[PDB]
Design an enzyme around this catalytic site. Structure first.
Site, short mmCIF file in Angstrom:
data_model
loop_
_atom_site.label_atom_id
_atom_site.label_comp_id
_atom_site.label_asym_id
_atom_site.label_seq_id
_atom_site.Cartn_x
_atom_site.Cartn_y
_atom_site.Cartn_z
N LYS A 156 -3.66 -12.60 41.17
CA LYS A 156 -2.82 -12.24 42.31
C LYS A 156 -3.11 -13.10 43.54
O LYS A 156 -2.27 -13.19 44.44
CB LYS A 156 -2.96 -10.76 42.66
CG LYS A 156 -2.34 -9.78 41.67
CD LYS A 156 -1.09 -9.07 42.14
CE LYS A 156 -0.86 -7.66 41.54
NZ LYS A 156 -1.36 -7.54 40.18
N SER A 167 -5.02 -11.32 32.60
CA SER A 167 -4.57 -11.32 33.98
C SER A 167 -5.57 -10.83 35.02
O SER A 167 -5.44 -11.14 36.20
CB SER A 167 -3.28 -10.50 34.09
OG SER A 167 -3.42 -9.21 33.50
#
Lengths: 494, 502, 502, 494
Positions: D50, D304
């Site tokens: 992110k 992720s």
């Protein structure tokens, strides 16, 4: 454009080509008032960018084509790029090059394990032989520039630059031969950041893109200059012109001397040597900055290659030296009544004379601000010396520098002596003072263009009955010397 | 030895110095029959190794010593090394250098935010001014070589080499000025891999380590040669000699010409230009290979620096040309006839002519000073001379005649024997084998050539001056005849330089 | 010392081992008031430092020794280190390991092209088989630690640390099995920067270096703990002890629980999982900081490996939970009434309930075994207990009762006192604070709860079993009532496991 | 698509985000018969991808917007990404997060110098407070996914992958929350190499993209699962769905247990820990390989993130263990006439009993090929032991494991002793043999799930007049032990 960018993003160049620095040129930036950045394609393994395009082309071939091998017609950077590319893929490469091609370039190709076939007096014959072998043997021709995969490979240069300089970037200056490099760069730049100008740079003697853009078609130049051998291309490529005609903003042309000064500028900031084609971009930048009175811009030059023979550097340095206006050349008449006292401890580059009233061809270091030649000339004249200022006299600098001598009609008793002394402030004048005037000096030659040892030849009028004194007198001076009176080179010409 | 190695292993050089490649010199290796490897200290940010030692010294200083700043006296590599080192540490640096020092080197120092003080006509006066400012202002002097922390910094070169070449390594060749570089290398090498020879290389004109080792004390040379300016040091350092006397195997000396040939060799294999001091090591290797008839060895050269003024390449190239002896120089006698000079140019053929100079002396005969490129295998000098003689040309071979190459090359000319009809014209044409003969063909034979000068030493544009005997009543023909040649030309008949000297 | 440093400086480890980060442990540093740095040897390709030593040993072998190949006996890190090392050198490797060895470790070895020979029920038999094959087949044995070339390889860890942390460094903490790692580190550190303390860390159950140092000879421990399997070594190496006895400052021992808490600490700062041996160093640091009341020091831990089976994390987490003592365990007495169990669940509120277990014993009263997350500052155990008591609940605090946490947690149940109307239902609901009480609310109070089991140790899906007293004539209501709850459920009344045990 | 690719190529992510490895998962590849590659976004400085999107968004803001500061509403990976991004730009960041947010996540944000404002019981209230502060204070809101600059930043993941794996690549598997990551990847992939499949992976409990694609509009899920907290998003983003609807090939859904097994698989190949959202992609790959019987494919998973609390790993390991079918659970009746002899030196995980005819709850390590439980059960029965196989009995494994005990109606003279012994093959049985039968065992509990120390509690029927013998007898066994007869936890519950 999109098609080219996709090919650039998926190229295979990094199997063997490397990412190159984008380096500030500090002193050039200060002089120009603009941020100048040098893209160091000279740091590729073949000392030019051409490994990118040649490899990308070769790597896209079918297994079958690779099995048969690749061919090109080139004596130069492309030859080396293709040879290395082929070696990296483990495939056979044939490079056809003129019979006249220099042996050092032939060996550079063979060093990468390519077969160098010597055929033709010039490129067109080499090319025809190569194209024949394509049909005979099934080799895949690899074009130096006019091939989409080649263009895409060269375009990786722009991909790097835009990543390395994400902020302000006013213009990228690119040398142009057949237009592979600039087409690939223009494609990528005009796609991603069209506000950046893409400026081609060509020699005056090889301006095939500039002329094509002006004419709106692919004109064939009547001939190309030999100096910038990297861009000796008479006609812009077809695939390259299809991009350039719309996506190159303009082409600036530069002269041989401008190129020579750019080679020195690059060296002064990076210690790297560019070949003439590799210095075009910086030469273009300098010409652009003056034409636009640019200030505060960020300007990128592609330093495209470094394949210039050592022997060419002497000439490059000679031409770049002229720009510097350090060397004064003056013709000084010596009355029959010092001189060296007035000239002081300045660096003498030339001090030549031969008896005919006495005239000396004098080269002397000066500085426009710190030690201007005009004041020295006035100084010498005011001391009663006739002085001609030959600093701007081309014949003087190109030729007369090498022509003061000849036979003298009425010098008998001339003996000739060569001397060597360590270079030092005042050394020449100190030598002449110690040499003294026991015998009349009837000839002198001395040059010093970065020399280590002072080397002088002097003619002395030594009567027959005083010649026994020569060894003693000259040894007392304290320098190595040789009696050259019987040297046939002296006898014939002087 | 141990003490120095510990200092090398804890040095601070990598705050700003970088690891440099150890690169194969392929063509040199093939010629010599030994694996030659080049340590590329020219690729440091200041283009020499000196950033290592200067930075390590500065970094070891106390906060007190750093307070007012550092000072040095140097017109070259040390100046730049120290200036960058000081900038990296955020400290003030003053560099003293002679008034005569070139502007380009002055600006390089100022570019790193160091003060460049111009003082003295020669180095010793600059040095004395710097040392005075130490006391006056409280700056800490930073010595170019004679300091343990400097030595330790330079020694990181050896630490890299031994890591980069862990296998066979017969000898490391090191340029020697005051001995910082070689002392640091010797310390590390003799500690870790003492079977490796550490060989110093100095110019004949500046052999302060070789002389010191031979004499067993720190002799002061009566003078130093200025060609290899990076190693112009009269006396070996004290701290450096303490290491070298036991841990350097020997010093080989080389000549200026050997250095020049080494500069070219390095360029031919890497495209890098070394300064004279930076090419010493390769020059030493070549001399060593011949002296030992070495075969199959691995030999490392420190390419220590690249800080040579561009204009000095002219001289370097001139000297590297001599030896190889590719340039033939010959004196050719021809009859004084309208077309003899041209006919002789024809006989020379499509070759790189470097010199083609003549000036009328008597009606009896003419002499031409000719330079021509030759090749021992491909186009031998001896065969060309015989070829020309067999065509009925008296030829003297002046290729090994030093006066000819050094001086006569620049002395064929002088005043016309008599008053006559001499007009003088300068021309330019694209330089190419056969271009001169093509020019003389286009010029044709209406008028006797009474003077000619033409030099071509890698030139792009061919340049000639010709004196032509043009009778007054034929001078109307000149513009059209010379324009028809198709080249730029200038009438220099009234040029004062021509009148005065010729 | 010198001999070892020279071997470290000339090691071959970087053919396959990599330089590893020296990383700040931010939260641990804040807690401890010292700068803690973690040497990440877990980031080697084989997830431990052992690739360094194994490779350096293999690389120093003669062509003769390499010819038939190398062999080792290991079920863990050394096996992988050697297997990869051998693959890199292009040599045959045989690794002998017990028949019992897990399949995942066997396959890891085979993946590098090494032969995994399964032999013995325990390590000593595997070892003997390997040593036999040395003689039988001419393989060269590669020892996990007791070899100068191995030691030198491991020492490259120290070489990196001293380069990475050139400034203040008070102490380096090293796990100790047979002493290869710590000997190599100690050799290099005590040579170059002897002011740095080198502190070994061993489990209480495997303190072979600590005992050897205290006794001044290489004692054999009567047994070794198997928790920290990477350092399960009964006797310090000979070559290793020769260094350690003089150059290791001390050995700190730590418990299994201290190791478990260190595993979590490392995870919390880096997201890396260390195996027990790999967390010893941080455990040592924590014990040292308290023992010395250290402040402002720089302390380095070798995170030596990450080869712990995933399933062992369950136990690690259970032990790290104990201490912190966030989980309260209480025994709560309630009357036997239709709604008392629910009402008590309500009083506990919206908290992470970890255990809520009960089984009917008499009509007089009921006891609930309750686990609840608490926080010393935010939701203290003591205040919650007082809160529940003040609401009229008898509560015993069993938080520090070892039997309660280890055993009774798993023992509330047993057979129904009498025959009755017990039906058994399993349910699942999304786990969330208050989900249990919401479930009991939805379940409602038609039927007495006579049995309940509910555990929640980080669960995603909440799982409960309930015994309900459902009279025969009300059983028709069950499907609709339980479906109305809206959760998956199963009628387990006829489940044989329920019948037999409950 | 073109617009997004240009933004990806000019992103600012590399000021702080790093290039991450694309690592082979060796053992998973062997098992599946396909080349599986793991994109290690867990190695970003905030342990998730992110940072890419958040930084790229923040960096594009005006000088004025940066002066005022940035705000977000997040308790999770976005919060950390934005906080670090802001710190890197030297700008103020406010992160609004629910009052209920765990303290360790609050501190992670504050560690990067962001202000964490605690407001709301759940996200929607936090969001509304943040949006209010946008108007009040002039902060620029930074969305976790639904922003073109965020999408472009996440897309750099694909830019790397396609560069790192230029050869065969059949499919890229991407976890999907609000669709920023997969939209950015899909944009780049479908532009450059559209033959590659882009496959979203969502939890069954949070399938907002799958449902949106099926419905052709942005459906709002009634609720989202808490387990995969990284992708707890009820409605697909607008900007993200505009890309996904055409450029994502499909979404595969997976369960909690599938995720848990994927977390272990990733750990087994890399030693890295993924959070549930971070293991979705590998879970998707496994489900895809079986559904397609894929062989010889190259399949990429985006790992992720790694932001899962340590305490959650225990549960993850418990669930992944179930897949392994190592642990047999059997109920063994002991006649009143060994047992341990038949079971041999197998690893006991559970050994629980309480007097009521004698039944033992036994957990024992087995192997499907090497030591199958069916043969052991038959072996024990043939020896005359009633055995129930409870290995597939969910109540047994989830609950009865923790419920063997209770009070026994007619055990008097019960004394209770806790013991510890070092774990070793045969240790439990050796303990019970040394404990002997001088007194009747009326209770036993023992669990071993990776334990270091053997820990057992035993009830013994010791008549009052033999209790003087206890110290001697138990000390002779040689293990540490504690008399727990008066322990109130024992009294109340047993």
């Amino acid at each position: 454009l999109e098609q080219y960018v996709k090919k650039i993003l998926t190229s295979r160049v990094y199997d063997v080509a490397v990412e190159t620095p984008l380096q500030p040129a500090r002193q050039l930036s200060e002089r120009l008032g603009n941020q100048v950045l040098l893209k160091r394609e000279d740091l590729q393994p073949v000392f030019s960018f051409k490994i990118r395009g040649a490899y990308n082309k070769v790597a896209q071939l079918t297994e079958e084509e690779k099995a048969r091998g690749v061919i090109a017609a080139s004596a130069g950077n492309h030859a080396q790029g293709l040879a290395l590319a082929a070696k990296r893929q483990g495939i056979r490469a044939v490079i056809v090059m003129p019979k006249t091609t220099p042996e050092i370039k032939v060996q550079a190709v063979r060093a990468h394990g390519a077969k160098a076939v010597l055929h033709g007096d010039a490129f067109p014959e080499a090319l025809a032989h190569a194209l024949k072998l394509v049909d005979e043997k099934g080799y895949t021709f690899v074009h130096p520039y006019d091939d989409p995969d080649t263009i895409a490979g060269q375009g990786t240069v722009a991909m790097e630059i835009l990543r390395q300089q994400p902020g302000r970037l006013d213009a990228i200056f690119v040398p142009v031969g057949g237009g592979g490099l600039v087409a690939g760069i223009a494609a990528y730049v005009k796609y991603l950041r069209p506000e950046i100008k893409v400026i081609g740079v060509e020699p005056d003697e090889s301006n095939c893109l500039q002329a094509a853009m002006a004419a709106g078609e692919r004109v064939v130049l009547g001939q190309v200059g030999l100096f910038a051998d990297g861009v000796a291309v008479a006609q812009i490529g077809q695939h390259t012109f299809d991009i350039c005609k719309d996506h190159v903003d303009e082409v600036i042309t530069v002269s041989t001397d401008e190129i020579c000064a750019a080679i020195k500028d690059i060296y002064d900031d990076t210690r790297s040597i560019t070949e003439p084609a590799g210095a075009l971009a910086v030469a273009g930048i300098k010409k652009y900055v003056e034409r636009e009175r640019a200030e505060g811009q960020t300007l990128v030059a592609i330093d495209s290659g470094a394949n210039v023979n050592f022997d060419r550097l002497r000439h490059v340095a000679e031409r770049a030296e002229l720009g510097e206006r350090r060397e004064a050349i003056i013709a000084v008449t010596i009355p029959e009544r010092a001189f060296c006292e007035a000239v002081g401890k300045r660096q003498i580059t030339e001090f030549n004379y031969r008896y005919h009233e006495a005239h000396i061809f004098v080269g002397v270091q000066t500085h426009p601000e710190n030690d201007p030649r005009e004041a020295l000339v006035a100084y010498l004249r005011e001391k009663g010396f006739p002085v001609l200022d030959l600093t701007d006299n081309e014949l003087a600098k190109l030729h007369i520098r090498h022509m003061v001598g000849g036979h003298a009609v009425k010098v008998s008793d001339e003996m000739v002596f060569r001397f060597e002394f360590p270079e030092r402030p005042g050394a020449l004048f100190n030598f002449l003072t110690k040499l003294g005037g026991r015998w009349n000096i009837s000839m002198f030659h001395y040059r010093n263009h970065g020399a280590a040892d002072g080397r002088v030849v002097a003619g002395l009028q030594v009567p027959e009955d005083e010649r026994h004194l020569i060894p003693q007198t000259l040894e007392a001076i304290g320098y190595p010397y040789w009696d050259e009176t019987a040297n046939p080179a002296y006898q014939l010409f002087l």
